[PDB]
Amino acid sequence: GEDIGHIKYCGIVDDCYKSKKPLFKIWKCVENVCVLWYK
C-alpha cells in the first residue's frame, strides 16, 4: 500500500520544526497527561 507513509513521532516541537499538529484538540495537558476541558 503506497511507498510513502511515515509517522511524525515527536514531542513538543524540539527538532522536527514545521510540525503538522499531531495532536487532536488539546485542552489541558499537565504532568505528561492530557485531559479534556470543554466537555
Short mmCIF file of C-alpha atoms in Angstrom, two decimals:
data_model
loop_
_atom_site.label_atom_id
_atom_site.label_comp_id
_atom_site.label_asym_id
_atom_site.label_seq_id
_atom_site.Cartn_x
_atom_site.Cartn_y
_atom_site.Cartn_z
CA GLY A 1 0.00 0.00 0.00
CA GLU A 2 1.88 3.02 -1.32
CA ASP A 3 5.59 3.63 -0.73
CA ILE A 4 5.41 6.86 1.26
CA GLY A 5 3.78 6.97 4.68
CA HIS A 6 5.91 7.74 7.72
CA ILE A 7 4.77 8.94 11.14
CA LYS A 8 5.77 12.27 12.69
CA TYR A 9 6.65 10.83 16.10
CA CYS A 10 7.79 13.81 18.16
CA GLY A 11 7.32 15.55 21.50
CA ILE A 12 6.63 19.28 21.78
CA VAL A 13 8.42 20.81 18.80
CA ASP A 14 12.12 20.44 19.61
CA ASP A 15 13.89 19.39 16.41
CA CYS A 16 11.16 18.38 13.96
CA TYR A 17 10.23 22.01 13.29
CA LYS A 18 7.32 22.82 10.98
CA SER A 19 5.12 20.21 12.65
CA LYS A 20 1.65 19.34 11.36
CA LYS A 21 -0.27 19.28 14.65
CA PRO A 22 -0.06 15.58 15.60
CA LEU A 23 -2.49 16.27 18.43
CA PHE A 24 -6.29 16.21 18.23
CA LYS A 25 -7.97 19.03 20.14
CA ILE A 26 -5.65 19.77 23.07
CA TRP A 27 -7.49 21.11 26.12
CA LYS A 28 -5.47 20.77 29.32
CA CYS A 29 -2.23 18.78 29.41
CA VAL A 30 -0.04 18.65 32.52
CA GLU A 31 2.42 16.22 34.10
CA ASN A 32 2.72 14.32 30.82
CA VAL A 33 -1.05 13.79 30.93
CA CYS A 34 -3.61 15.26 28.54
CA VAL A 35 -7.13 15.91 29.81
CA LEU A 36 -10.29 17.41 28.30
CA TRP A 37 -11.88 20.68 29.40
CA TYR A 38 -14.70 21.59 27.02
CA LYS A 39 -16.96 18.69 27.99
#
